Nucleic acid binder design. Structure first.
Ligand code: SAH
Length: 327
DNA sequence: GTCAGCGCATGG
DNA sequence: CCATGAGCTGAC
C-alpha cells in the first residue's frame, strides 16, 4: 500500500460488509476514518480478521435486522461475484449468491448513509445485455442517490497485475456533490520480478513436468502486459506459464490446474507457482499483515480480495469532494 | 475438508 | 483467427 499524508477522512465512521480479509478497512483507516461494525460468515475468514484487527465479525447478513446496525457515514461492500463472473455459469439474479445486492438496498433505506462504496468484477457491467447494471442504477436513484461508475485496471496504478474491476460510488442527493472524479493513471515501475522471495524459501513450490512445451523465448526488457512463454497439458486454466518480466494474471479463489489459483512462472530456469506472501504483495498488502496458518485457505482469501492501492486513491478523492464547502 | 483436469463466453 | 477469467465438478 501507499502512504497518505493528508488524512482527508478524519472523523467519519463506516461499516465493513462481506469483510473478507479487511481490504476495505486498511484503505479507509489509512485516511483517518473509523470502523464501527463488520460482517463476514466464513469460519476461517473470521479467524484472520480477529488475528489482525482484534474483533470477530457478525455472521449471516441475510438474517440480521437492519435496525440493529449502528449509525454510519459510509457503507462499504464487495458483494459475491460467482453469479456474474465470466469464468462461471452466468446465472445472475436466479442464483442464491446473486441476490446479495438487495440486502444492501434494504440496509440503505434505513440508515440513509452519506456515501455507498461498492465494487465487483468487469463482466458485471456487461451481464445480461447491460440489464443488471441498470437495475442497480435505478434502485440507487430511487433511494435518492447519484450513481457514478467506472472500470479500472490495476496495472495503471502501481501494482503489476492485470486485474479489471468496476467501481460504484454513490452520494446522497442533498449533499449536492458535483466534483467527484476517478483517479488519473500513471506509468508502471514495478514488475513481478521485484516482489519475489529468495530461492531458498520457495524451493517446495517447484514443479518439473515432462509435458512442458515452450512456445516463446524469454524476453530481455520489461513491459506492462502478460507475456506467455509456455504451456502444459492442454493449456487450460492453471496450465499456462508466464514471464516474470511482465505482469501477473488475475488471482482466483476456486480455480484448478496444476498451477492452481496463481498460475505458473519461469523463475531462474525453473517453473513454480507463487507463495502466499508473494500473493499478498501483488494485491498491495504490507509485509506486516499476518496470513492464515493454513496455506490452502490463504490462497482462497487473497483471490477473493481487493487491491489496496486502487482503493486508497479513490478514498482520498471521496473525502476531497466532501470537504469542499465554500461560502 | 483438499486436489487437479476441464470447457466455454467474451473481447478482440 | 487468438488469448483470457475474485469458476465447476468429481475424486478421495
Ligand atoms: N450471506 C453472507 N453473509 C456474510 N458474508 C457472506 C455471505 N455470503 C458471502 N459472504 C462473504 O462475502 C465475501 C465476498 S468477497 C469480499 C472480500 C473483501 N472485499 C476483502 O477485502 O477481502 C466472502 O468473504 C464471502 O464469504
Amino acid at each position: 500500500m501507499i502512504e497518505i499524508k493528508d488524512k482527508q477522512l478524519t472523523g467519519l465512521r463506516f461499516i465493513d460488509l462481506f469483510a473478507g480479509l479487511g481490504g476495505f478497512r486498511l484503505a479507509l483507516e489509512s485516511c483517518g476514518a473509523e470502523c464501527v461494525y463488520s460482517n463476514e460468515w466464513d469460519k476461517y475468514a473470521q479467524e484472520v480478521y480477529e488475528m489482525n484487527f482484534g474483533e470477530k465479525p457478525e455472521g449471516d447478513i441475510t438474517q440480521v435486522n437492519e435496525k440493529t446496525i449502528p449509525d454510519h457515514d459510509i457503507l462499504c461492500a464487495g458483494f459475491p461475484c460467482q453469479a456474474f463472473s465470466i469464468s462461471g455459469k452466468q446465472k445472475g439474479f436466479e442464483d442464491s449468491r446473486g441476490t446479495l445486492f438487495f440486502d444492501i438496498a434494504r440496509i440503505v433505506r434505513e440508515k440513509k448513509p452519506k456515501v455507498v462504496f461498492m465494487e465487483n468484477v468487469k463482466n458485471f457491467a456487461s451481464h445480461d445485455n447491460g440489464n443488471t447494471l441498470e437495475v442497480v442504477k435505478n434502485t440507487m436513484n430511487e433511494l435518492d442517490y447519484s450513481f457514478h461508475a467506472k472500470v479500472l485496471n490495476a496495472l495503471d496504478y502501481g501494482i503489476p497485475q492485470k486485474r479489471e474491476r468496476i467501481y460504484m460510488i454513490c452520494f446522497r442527493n442533498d449533499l449536492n456533490i458535483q466534483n467527484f472524479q476517478f483517479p488519473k493513471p500513471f506509468e508502471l515501475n514495478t514488475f513481478v520480478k521485484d516482489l519475489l522471495l529468495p530461492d531458498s524459501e520457495v524451493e517446495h513450490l517447484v514443479i518439473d513436468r515432462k509435458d512442458l512445451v515452450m512456445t516463446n523465448q524469454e524476453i530481455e526488457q520489461t513491459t506492462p502486459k502478460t507475456v506467455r512463454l509456455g504451456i502444459v497439458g492442454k493449456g487450460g486454466q492453471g496450465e499456462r506459464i508466464y514471464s516474470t518480466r511482465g505482469i501477473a494474471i488475475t488471482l482466483s479463489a476456486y480455480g484448478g490446474g496444476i498451477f492452481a489459483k496463481t498460475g505458473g512462472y519461469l523463475v531462474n530456469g525453473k517453473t513454480r507457482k507463487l507463495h502466499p506472501r508473494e500473493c499478498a504483495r501483488v494485491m498491495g498488502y504490507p509485509d506486516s499483515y499476518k496470513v492464515h496458518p493454513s496455506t490452502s485457505q490463504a490462497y482462497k482469501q487473497f483471490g477473493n480480495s481487493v487491491v489496496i492501492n486502487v482503493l486508497q486513491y479513490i478514498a482520498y478523492n471521496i473525502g476531497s469532494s466532501l470537504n469542499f464547502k465554500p461560502y
